[PDB]
Amino acid sequence: SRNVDKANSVLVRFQEQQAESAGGYKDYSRYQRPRNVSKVKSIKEANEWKRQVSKEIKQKSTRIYDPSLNEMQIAELNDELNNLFKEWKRWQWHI
Amino acid sequence: MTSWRDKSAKVQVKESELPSSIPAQTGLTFNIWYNKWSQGFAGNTRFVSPFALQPQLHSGKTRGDNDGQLFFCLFFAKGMCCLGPKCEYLHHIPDEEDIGKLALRTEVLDCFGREKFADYREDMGGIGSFRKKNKTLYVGGIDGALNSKHLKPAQIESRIRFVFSRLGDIDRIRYVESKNCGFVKFKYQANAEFAKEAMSNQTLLLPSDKEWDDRREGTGLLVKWANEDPDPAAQKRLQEELKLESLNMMVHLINNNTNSA
Amino acid sequence: LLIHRKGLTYLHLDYNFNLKPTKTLTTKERKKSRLGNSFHLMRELLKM
Amino acid sequence: MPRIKTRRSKPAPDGFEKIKPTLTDFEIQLRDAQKDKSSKLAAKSNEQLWEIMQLHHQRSRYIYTLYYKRKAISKDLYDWLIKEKYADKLLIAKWRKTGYEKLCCLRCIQKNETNNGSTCICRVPRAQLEEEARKKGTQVSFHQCVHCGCRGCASTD
Amino acid sequence: LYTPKAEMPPEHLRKIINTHSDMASKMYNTDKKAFLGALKYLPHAILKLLENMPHPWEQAKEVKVLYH
Amino acid sequence: FTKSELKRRRKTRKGDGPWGSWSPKKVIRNYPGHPEGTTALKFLPKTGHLILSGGNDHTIKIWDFECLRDFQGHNKPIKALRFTEDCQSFLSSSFDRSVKIWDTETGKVKTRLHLNSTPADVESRPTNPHEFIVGLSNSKILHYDDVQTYDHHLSSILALKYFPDGSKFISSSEDKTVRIWENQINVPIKQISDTASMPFLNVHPNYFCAQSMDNRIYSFSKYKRHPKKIHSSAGYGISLAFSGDGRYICSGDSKSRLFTWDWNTSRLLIPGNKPITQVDWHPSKVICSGAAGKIYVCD
Amino acid sequence: DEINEPPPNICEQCLGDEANIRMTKIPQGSECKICTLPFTLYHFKTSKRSNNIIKTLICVRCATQRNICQCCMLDSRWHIPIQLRDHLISLVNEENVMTEEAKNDMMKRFLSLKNVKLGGAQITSDPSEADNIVDKLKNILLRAYASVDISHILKKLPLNESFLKNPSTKSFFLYNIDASIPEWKITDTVSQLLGIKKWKDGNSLSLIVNHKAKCGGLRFQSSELGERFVSKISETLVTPKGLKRGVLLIDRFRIFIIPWSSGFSAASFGTNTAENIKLSLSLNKLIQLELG
Amino acid sequence: DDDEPPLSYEQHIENIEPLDPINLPLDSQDDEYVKDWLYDSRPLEEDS
Ligand SMILES: [Zn+2]
Ligand SMILES: [Zn+2]
Ligand SMILES: [Zn+2]
Ligand SMILES: [Zn+2]
Ligand SMILES: [Zn+2]
Ligand SMILES: [Zn+2]
């Protein structure tokens, strides 16, 4: 079984849940957007969320200019770059 | 003399008041060999120094003054020395008398006694190289230092001129607003090595500002070693002072051949 | 200290000298954390 | 014969109850000196080792002045304190020599510990150290030795 | 020019062991190498400990030790 | 050199020689000595040299931070005790329907405040104004001149605090409300009823307060809690303490809502008797009164 | 060869003045600073009662190829750094001599095992080839922004007032400062003039110089020092309208002064680098108007 | 238990009276020559 299975087991989840309650872990490399921005919390928390969005920007931006030869995919890639751009701004308003 | 030789050096931080030796938890399990945190990501790991040097307050005679110590206390510069007057190293701003003692010694190692290296570190941080007598510091990371006050482009330079003037004789201070960074050049390298460790991870706030209670929450400013100055208005100054250094050495060197004959 | 110098912080050495993994291990970790006879035979002497 | 009061251990002689409250004060300071006070400096960590060698010295100067200087305890008590390890047998035995009167410890006279074949510098008289520093034009650089923190055991000072 | 070994107090050993509980400081970097390079001598320390084990008619047993 | 000189120079040493110079939380201490349970605890605000601990035996025992003195003079259980900053005064309040002042200098009762209807469970000293704030089963707050009566809470008032700026009185009651009081107009400025009895409050030394309940400790300008079964104290280090009646000491950070430690006290030489009734920090230590008849010191 | 190894190359001034020095040999001590490859660490102390251990930082092969000592890494003859040595020989042979060094670890090791000399290490270690170049050094000694709106700033610079005794001010305005002439050299020249030496202890004077605007100001604490700064300056230049200006006199340079009569602060000179260059360009005319 | 560390000698062990060991009673009329010294650590160590 691939490490996708081994990473999501109960014990690995348990110590992250302690590290939330004992320190400054959590990472944020784990979780989603989260769907709303007005429901987000303090800024020092959100800066790491915002930093994560920059990193998928850099993956997408490096992916745009390639000769993948797929006009549909690069159209899709410009769409995520545009939504992550609009996403990068909504955290700035939240900041 | 009146500011320094008159009094004795004072305990900056109590030994119970010293920070904990384990770092802030950025991982799941602590590692005992490498005193760091292992599992989990790596988060951040730069914080504002809780301590700072008040140079006219903390300076004084130490145990290293009577012993003829050449080297300055590293934790005096950080504002963290718990030994006070019982410390083996010096607790004062370097002067021409002090750097004259270090003159045979500064070539390979800094004013704090730490040995220099062949080439610089990749981010220009650290101790320094013995191949270049670098006397210019890159004052960077000012935004986290100010705690994101807008202040301006001149005020920021005023903070840099006030703080680094206490740490020794200055050749020049240049602030660049577009690059949001400063370049401080000292008269001696030993002041630049002292002021680098003194102003690493500090904050340019002063109390006269509202954020003084939140000075700890920020990131802290980076003092690192500076690169060469690329404008030819300064490049011509470099070969001019290198020319004067060469003429001052040839006079000293023909007297060696005069004595040798 | 030997376990932790090798970076094997996911292995817990008990006070009764039992060596147990703290989590479900990836394969690069199970290759890396495969201690030899001289570690375990030293560990079983200390258990005795 | 041990430190622990075992049943193989011999009961105390007559004069022990007079000197027992003094010996307990040296005993409770040794338990507070071994307490693991966590200090991060190496200049402070050996300094806590220097307090133990001081108290083991001061517990042994006490029994030395009881028996050899003031003759205030019996030989059967003084032999009992050595067997029960209240006093260092070999450290007292150096204090009886003419040159080793105020002997730091036993480690500061080992010729084999040092890099040279020399004693510790706390064995040197202070007026000898002032004389050599006077020719060098400086103050004397020695304050406390690394073995136990002494400041001069020379018998002349 | 040989004098014998100096017979330290028992508390001098005892403070050292207690001090080396939490080796988190930078001062312990040399002493961590000393713990790790002593691991080859540790089977000799187990034999000398188990051969001097107190027999059933003994409450306690003072042994003479050599310590780093 | 000479023998008389070396005899003189060896007396220059400060000692005699050879060492004379030529030049989480844990439990540190347990303190017994109250005959009954200990209800309230306050500390000297200037020097930190002493405690003032109430009791269920009607006495007050001043503990050294040893037992210094005993202050009798109440007929019933002393629910609250508060020490003044700018004055050398001690305001104690008990179940005997009286707020009694104490001159710390001579150790005698100076003043008795009157006209409470029933047992007075809270005293808080206003900082600047030389006022007293008392609250009780009267369901009203009385502002005493060391004048104003505030009505609103529909049940008994458990904890009361004072602050210099606006909303000068924060109050908490068993109608599960927390009100912020405008004392000059003598009416409510703001109502915070989000608790589902609020038995404890504590002021952060950030201009905020920490509000307690049975299972949820909130803050007011949350905290992650499972069933803790119910005092609060705020260190200057951010850490926020929570006393439980299930013996559990819930330590928390105030910024986060995070809970970093949960401890369990050892009862005594009954298992139901092991709660923590009151708690306070110094001006790096924690001093907690328990119903097992002991004061415990947490380091 | 591990059993046949050269003796260490250390300076005479590293060893110091004493005759017998007890030196400690460790056969594979640290690794070299240059080649990152192990060697025999020698370390020693100058006197017996010293407090500084002098270690050999580089191996003997890296010390031979550079012709430097192992401890202080200065040249064995002439006792100068390498960067100054290869610059002095470049003034003699009229070509650049330079020891170049690897930044790669496999080429730091490679460059050390070869038996060549590097840079000026052919010239030095030959006493005949060194002494004639010193003679060739001796013949060298026989030779021995128009778009900017700057008008908000020049109202605050004085530029129209005179350097007399009669105003009693703390601050002054120094213009005509070259891009050379460090900030320490102007405070030392003023403190030499007043005898208020070691001024940084008492903070008697505070000086701000831009080095882009070619202008600056120096503020005194204790206004009675201002009359000492006026009276200790003798030479002045009178502009042909009037309005006499004192000259500070750094070696070969001339720096003009006018009492500010208020505190200038930072940012009086400029708030942007492009903006400060035009103030030096603004002044250059007034200096030429003051002199000629 | 393997979770609890080896408890320190001085806070726990050293302060307590040890126990009685295994000793046969050694009848005095039949064993008078050995009963004074049989159960020592080193028997007759200081007898010259
Ligand atoms: Zn220091
Ligand atoms: Zn000594
Ligand atoms: Zn000693
Ligand atoms: Zn010694
Ligand atoms: Zn090399
Ligand atoms: Zn050298």
Side-chain angles (χ1 to χ4, degrees), chain A, chain B, chain C, chain D, chain E residues 2-68, chain F residues 1-24 26-27 29 32-35 37-40 45 47-48 53-57 59 61 63-64 67 73-74 77 80 84 87 89 92-94 96 98-100 102-107 109 111 117-120 124 126-127 129 134-135 137 139 141 145 147 149 153 156-157 159 164 166-167 171-173 175 177-179 181 188 190 193 195-197 199 204-205 209-210 217 219 227 230 232-235 237 239-241 244-246 250-256 260 265-266 271-272 275 277 279 283-284 286-288 290-293 295 297-298, chain G residues 1-277 279-292, chain H:
Chain A
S1 66
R2 293 177 177 89
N3 59 358
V4 176
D5 291 331
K6 295 180 179 181
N8 298 317
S9 67
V10 188
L11 283 78
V12 182
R13 291 182 288 171
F14 177 73
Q15 293 106 25
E16 294 177 355
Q17 281 156 335
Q18 283 182 349
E20 298 184 354
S21 294
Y25 195 58
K26 80 176 42 179
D27 337 298
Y28 289 151
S29 66
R30 295 294 180 92
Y31 306 111
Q32 74 282 25
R33 301 163 284 177
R35 188 176 177 87
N36 197 359
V37 150
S38 67
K39 300 296 286 185
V40 185
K41 298 301 290 183
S42 69
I43 171 175
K44 61 176 183 65
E45 195 274 333
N47 282 317
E48 296 174 351
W49 292 106
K50 189 182 75 173
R51 182 183 292 171
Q52 190 192 9
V53 176
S54 157
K55 304 188 295 185
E56 295 104 15
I57 279 292
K58 192 177 264 76
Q59 293 182 359
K60 262 60 183 297
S61 296
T62 51
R63 194 185 286 272
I64 285 173
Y65 286 96
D66 64 354
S68 285
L69 300 174
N70 288 316
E71 290 183 354
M72 185 269 288
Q73 292 295 106
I74 63 98
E76 184 72 24
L77 292 173
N78 197 2
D79 290 332
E80 290 106 14
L81 174 133
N82 284 316
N83 72 24
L84 291 165
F85 276 174
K86 298 183 176 69
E87 222 182 16
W88 177 268
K89 291 186 284 183
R90 62 194 283 181
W91 263 278
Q92 285 178 345
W93 284 7
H94 176 268
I95 285 167
Chain B
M1 184 67 205
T2 306
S3 294
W4 176 57
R5 286 180 182 88
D6 195 2
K7 67 181 74 174
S8 68
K10 12 209 35 33
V11 176
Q12 288 172 343
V13 180
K14 274 76 179 174
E15 66 178 359
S16 65
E17 184 64 27
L18 289 174
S20 179
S21 64
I22 55 98
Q25 182 177 2
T26 64
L28 200 275
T29 61
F30 193 43
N31 192 2
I32 297 171
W33 198 279
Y34 299 102
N35 292 319
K36 290 178 184 294
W37 291 92
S38 296
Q39 264 76 114
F41 77 176
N44 241 115
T45 196
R46 294 185 65 248
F47 58 95
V48 170
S49 175
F51 328 127
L53 176 62
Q54 264 114 260
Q56 71 272 15
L57 181 64
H58 297 293
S59 299
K61 299 291 287 185
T62 181
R63 194 190 294 280
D65 280 322
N66 290 317
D67 295 334
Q69 183 68 43
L70 298 177
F71 295 151
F72 295 94
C73 181
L74 183 60
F75 303 98
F76 175 73
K78 295 181 176 65
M80 293 175 69
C81 188
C82 69
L83 295 171
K86 300 296 183 181
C87 181
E88 293 291 330
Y89 297 105
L90 304 181
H91 290 77
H92 56 100
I93 295 99
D95 192 73
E96 294 181 352
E97 184 176 0
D98 302 322
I99 301 163
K101 293 182 176 66
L102 289 168
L104 297 173
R105 189 81 275 182
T106 317
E107 179 69 27
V108 302
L109 53 89
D110 61 355
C111 65
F112 298 108
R114 298 175 297 171
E115 297 171 354
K116 292 191 283 186
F117 287 87
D119 50 353
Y120 289 100
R121 189 178 167 86
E122 179 66 30
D123 56 355
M124 293 299 113
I127 300 167
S129 175
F130 58 88
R131 299 187 184 276
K132 183 178 178 181
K133 293 180 183 180
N134 195 358
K135 295 188 287 184
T136 304
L137 293 172
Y138 173 73
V139 179
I142 300 174
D143 49 357
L146 297 176
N147 292 319
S148 296
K149 290 177 99 291
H150 159 124
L151 292 105
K152 256 264 188 38
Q155 291 55 82
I156 292 171
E157 184 178 0
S158 178
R159 310 297 213 44
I160 291 173
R161 290 184 188 273
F162 181 73
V163 175
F164 288 95
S165 69
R166 298 180 298 173
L167 297 176
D169 295 332
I170 291 174
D171 208 39
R172 67 185 67 252
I173 295 171
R174 176 72 182 274
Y175 180 69
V176 179
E177 170 58 25
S178 70
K179 296 292 183 181
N180 198 5
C181 70
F183 293 96
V184 182
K185 187 177 181 183
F186 288 94
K187 183 185 188 295
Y188 293 103
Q189 184 179 0
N191 293 113
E193 294 162 349
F194 184 76
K196 179 178 182 293
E197 295 295 326
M199 289 304 293
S200 299
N201 298 117
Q202 294 293 323
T203 68
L204 343 69
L205 288 271
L206 325 202
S208 348
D209 295 342
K210 62 180 176 63
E211 297 87 357
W212 185 254
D213 291 331
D214 289 330
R215 57 173 182 168
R216 187 185 294 268
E217 293 180 352
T219 303
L221 66 97
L222 289 82
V223 172
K224 298 188 291 183
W225 291 103
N227 298 113
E228 291 180 353
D229 198 355
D231 51 346
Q235 293 291 323
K236 291 174 95 288
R237 299 182 298 178
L238 261 297
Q239 293 103 27
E240 185 176 2
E241 291 179 353
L242 181 61
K243 185 261 293 179
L244 182 61
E245 181 65 31
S246 298
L247 268 72
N248 288 316
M249 185 54 69
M250 290 185 285
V251 174
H252 177 76
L253 190 56
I254 61 168
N255 289 321
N256 197 2
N257 205 171
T258 301
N259 292 318
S260 179
Chain C
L1 199 57
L2 180 64
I3 291 168
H4 283 183
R5 189 183 185 274
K6 293 173 74 74
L8 306 178
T9 61
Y10 50 84
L11 293 176
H12 185 76
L13 198 277
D14 283 327
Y15 290 103
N16 289 327
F17 295 96
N18 291 315
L19 184 63
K20 294 174 184 179
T22 61
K23 68 183 181 68
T24 305
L25 300 186
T26 67
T27 315
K28 192 177 263 76
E29 289 174 349
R30 283 194 292 111
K31 293 185 174 75
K32 179 67 69 177
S33 70
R34 188 169 299 123
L35 276 308
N37 287 323
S38 68
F39 183 82
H40 290 292
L41 202 276
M42 195 62 218
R43 184 184 59 82
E44 296 294 328
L45 262 297
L46 290 175
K47 185 187 287 186
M48 186 187 80
Chain D
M1 294 299 292
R3 172 70 75 194
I4 301 172
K5 182 67 176 177
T6 63
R7 191 173 61 190
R8 297 292 93 193
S9 178
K10 184 179 182 293
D14 194 5
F16 179 71
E17 295 293 326
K18 186 180 290 294
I19 65 170
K20 186 178 179 180
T22 59
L23 295 178
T24 307
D25 291 332
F26 292 105
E27 195 273 336
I28 62 170
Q29 291 176 358
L30 287 173
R31 293 178 68 251
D32 292 333
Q34 71 197 10
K35 188 59 71 177
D36 190 8
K37 297 185 290 293
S38 66
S39 66
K40 66 171 70 174
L41 276 76
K44 294 290 179 68
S45 69
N46 57 1
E47 187 176 0
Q48 295 178 356
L49 291 171
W50 293 348
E51 296 294 327
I52 296 173
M53 298 299 291
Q54 185 177 2
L55 295 175
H56 180 75
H57 177 81
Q58 290 175 357
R59 189 178 66 187
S60 294
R61 295 290 297 171
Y62 182 74
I63 302 170
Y64 180 72
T65 58
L66 288 174
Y67 183 72
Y68 291 102
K69 296 295 183 182
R70 200 169 63 244
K71 268 68 184 299
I73 61 170
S74 69
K75 185 178 184 293
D76 292 329
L77 180 62
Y78 178 71
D79 291 332
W80 181 74
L81 295 175
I82 293 172
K83 294 180 177 67
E84 297 288 323
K85 298 290 183 182
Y86 289 98
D88 195 359
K89 178 68 173 179
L90 299 175
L91 181 60
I92 290 173
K94 295 291 183 182
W95 294 342
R96 299 179 66 189
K97 278 94 173 68
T98 286
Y100 296 165
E101 297 289 334
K102 293 180 181 180
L103 183 45
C104 200
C105 38
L106 295 174
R107 191 176 179 182
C108 284
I109 57 169
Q110 297 292 109
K111 298 289 184 69
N112 299 115
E113 294 282 320
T114 60
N115 292 318
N116 292 317
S118 297
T119 61
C120 184
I121 194 169
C122 67
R123 295 295 306 161
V124 178
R126 183 72 173 172
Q128 184 65 42
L129 291 176
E130 295 293 327
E131 181 69 28
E132 294 294 327
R134 186 180 298 276
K135 293 181 175 67
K136 298 297 289 182
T138 63
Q139 291 84 17
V140 56
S141 177
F142 176 65
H143 299 286
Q144 284 174 349
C145 72
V146 72
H147 298 292
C148 43
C150 174
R151 285 166 169 168
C153 350
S155 302
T156 188
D157 57 3
Chain E
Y2 180 77
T3 58
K5 183 62 73 176
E7 186 66 29
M8 289 296 108
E11 294 87 4
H12 183 273
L13 169 62
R14 181 179 290 171
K15 178 68 173 180
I16 291 172
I17 160 40
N18 292 319
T19 305
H20 289 287
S21 297
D22 48 355
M23 300 174 74
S25 175
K26 189 176 286 293
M27 64 174 284
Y28 295 101
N29 285 321
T30 305
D31 296 334
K32 288 175 184 179
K33 293 182 180 183
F35 286 13
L36 199 64
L39 188 59
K40 61 180 180 292
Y41 293 152
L42 192 62
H44 198 278
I46 294 173
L47 182 144
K48 301 299 287 185
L49 180 66
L50 267 70
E51 72 177 359
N52 284 306
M53 177 168 66
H55 299 281
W57 55 86
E58 290 178 352
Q59 296 182 357
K61 209 153 152 297
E62 293 289 326
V63 297
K64 182 178 285 184
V65 300
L66 189 69
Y67 61 94
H68 191 267
Chain F
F1 246 107
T2 61
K3 293 181 176 70
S4 66
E5 181 69 29
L6 296 169
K7 180 74 172 180
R8 185 179 294 112
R9 291 181 66 249
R10 75 186 70 186
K11 299 293 185 288
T12 310
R13 299 179 72 183
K14 303 287 104 175
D16 56 350
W19 287 267
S21 67
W22 291 94
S23 84
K26 65 183 181 181
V27 180
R29 188 171 293 171
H34 294 286
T38 170
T39 299
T47 284
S53 294
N56 200 3
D57 60 347
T59 63
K61 294 184 184 293
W63 294 96
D64 193 355
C67 182
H74 288 286
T84 176
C87 295
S89 296
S92 66
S93 64
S94 173
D96 59 353
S98 67
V99 175
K100 291 187 184 294
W102 294 95
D103 194 1
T104 292
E105 294 182 356
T106 296
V109 290
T111 306
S117 296
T118 60
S124 181
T127 340
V134 53
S137 297
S139 299
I141 306 166
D145 197 1
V147 172
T149 302
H153 281 308
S156 297
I157 295 169
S167 265
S171 64
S172 70
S173 61
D175 62 355
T177 67
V178 169
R179 283 183 170 90
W181 291 94
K190 184 68 177 176
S193 68
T195 292
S197 178
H204 189 273
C209 66
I217 302 166
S219 179
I230 293 149
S232 294
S233 293
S239 171
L240 174 65
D245 288 335
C250 183
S251 296
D253 186 76
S254 176
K255 293 289 197 290
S256 50
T260 71
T265 58
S266 179
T277 295
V279 62
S284 295
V286 180
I287 298 96
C288 60
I295 297 170
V297 290
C298 294
Chain G
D1 290 329
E2 68 272 13
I3 65 171
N4 295 115
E5 291 176 354
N9 192 3
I10 311 170
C11 286
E12 184 184 359
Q13 65 181 357
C14 299
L15 267 54
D17 293 333
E18 289 83 3
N20 195 1
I21 295 168
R22 182 179 176 87
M23 188 177 291
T24 299
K25 191 266 296 297
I26 295 97
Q28 289 175 357
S30 181
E31 64 184 4
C32 183
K33 294 291 185 181
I34 297 171
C35 68
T36 69
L37 196 66
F39 66 100
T40 64
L41 195 144
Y42 294 91
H43 66 85
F44 66 100
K45 292 169 70 175
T46 63
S47 67
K48 185 67 179 295
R49 290 298 99 205
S50 177
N51 52 0
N52 291 319
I53 295 171
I54 300 173
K55 292 169 68 177
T56 59
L57 298 175
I58 59 172
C59 64
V60 66
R61 292 183 290 112
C62 288
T64 300
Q65 291 177 355
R66 275 79 175 177
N67 193 7
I68 54 177
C69 87
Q70 297 182 3
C71 292
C72 77
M73 286 190 280
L74 298 178
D75 189 9
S76 296
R77 191 182 293 272
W78 300 352
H79 299 287
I80 57 174
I82 300 171
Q83 192 277 131
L84 186 59
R85 179 186 67 190
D86 297 336
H87 186 269
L88 289 177
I89 301 171
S90 298
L91 266 69
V92 172
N93 293 320
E94 294 292 327
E95 64 185 1
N96 47 357
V97 289
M98 180 182 72
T99 170
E100 63 183 3
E101 288 85 3
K103 286 94 172 66
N104 302 115
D105 289 332
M106 295 299 291
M107 180 55 204
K108 284 180 180 178
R109 299 171 185 173
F110 183 82
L111 187 147
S112 67
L113 270 69
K114 64 177 72 175
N115 289 316
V116 301
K117 299 292 181 69
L118 295 175
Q122 291 90 14
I123 286 95
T124 318
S125 67
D126 294 333
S128 67
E129 297 293 325
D131 290 332
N132 54 1
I133 291 179
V134 178
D135 299 332
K136 292 181 181 180
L137 295 174
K138 190 182 290 183
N139 296 117
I140 301 170
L141 269 300
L142 295 174
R143 301 279 75 78
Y145 291 98
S147 176
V148 67
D149 289 330
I150 206 165
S151 66
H152 285 173
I153 291 94
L154 274 78
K155 299 298 291 182
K156 299 285 102 177
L157 304 180
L159 301 178
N160 297 114
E161 287 83 5
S162 63
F163 181 70
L164 267 295
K165 180 263 295 178
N166 301 118
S168 63
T169 72
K170 289 181 185 291
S171 297
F172 294 93
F173 172 64
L174 319 177
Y175 70 105
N176 199 0
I177 296 167
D178 287 337
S180 181
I181 185 154
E183 184 170 356
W184 61 265
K185 193 175 288 292
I186 306 166
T187 60
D188 288 334
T189 305
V190 173
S191 65
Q192 184 65 253
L193 188 63
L194 297 178
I196 197 67
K197 81 282 191 186
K198 291 183 183 293
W199 60 272
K200 59 99 175 180
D201 293 333
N203 295 114
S204 65
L205 56 93
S206 177
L207 189 141
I208 296 171
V209 163
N210 197 4
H211 295 285
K212 298 295 286 184
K214 292 179 69 175
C215 295
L218 104 119
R219 300 175 270 128
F220 290 104
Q221 284 244 356
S222 86
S223 299
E224 54 89 17
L225 292 176
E227 289 87 1
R228 294 183 69 248
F229 182 72
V230 169
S231 181
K232 263 64 186 298
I233 294 172
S234 180
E235 185 67 27
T236 58
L237 286 178
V238 178
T239 301
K241 188 66 184 70
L243 279 307
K244 58 179 72 175
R245 311 293 179 87
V247 296
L248 205 36
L249 203 346
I250 288 51
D251 53 354
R252 294 180 60 84
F253 305 120
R254 304 180 80 187
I255 292 178
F256 304 101
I257 52 176
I258 351 81
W260 200 286
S261 180
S262 70
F264 50 96
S265 324
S268 172
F269 320 121
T271 317
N272 166 38
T273 187
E275 201 276 331
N276 285 313
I277 296 169
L279 195 146
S280 68
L281 292 173
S282 175
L283 275 202
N284 289 320
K285 296 181 178 68
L286 185 61
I287 294 163
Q288 293 177 356
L289 286 170
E290 176 175 355
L291 274 74
Chain H
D1 190 72
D2 50 354
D3 292 332
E4 58 186 1
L7 44 90
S8 68
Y9 177 79
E10 297 86 11
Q11 295 173 356
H12 301 283
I13 288 99
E14 188 181 2
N15 293 318
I16 197 62
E17 179 73 29
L19 247 92
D20 287 332
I22 300 172
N23 286 323
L24 194 68
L26 292 179
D27 181 75
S28 65
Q29 281 75 242
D30 289 329
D31 297 327
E32 71 273 19
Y33 290 105
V34 303
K35 71 182 185 294
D36 292 330
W37 55 269
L38 183 63
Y39 299 122
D40 294 332
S41 65
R42 291 182 181 93
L44 299 174
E45 182 182 1
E46 68 271 13
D47 197 0
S48 296

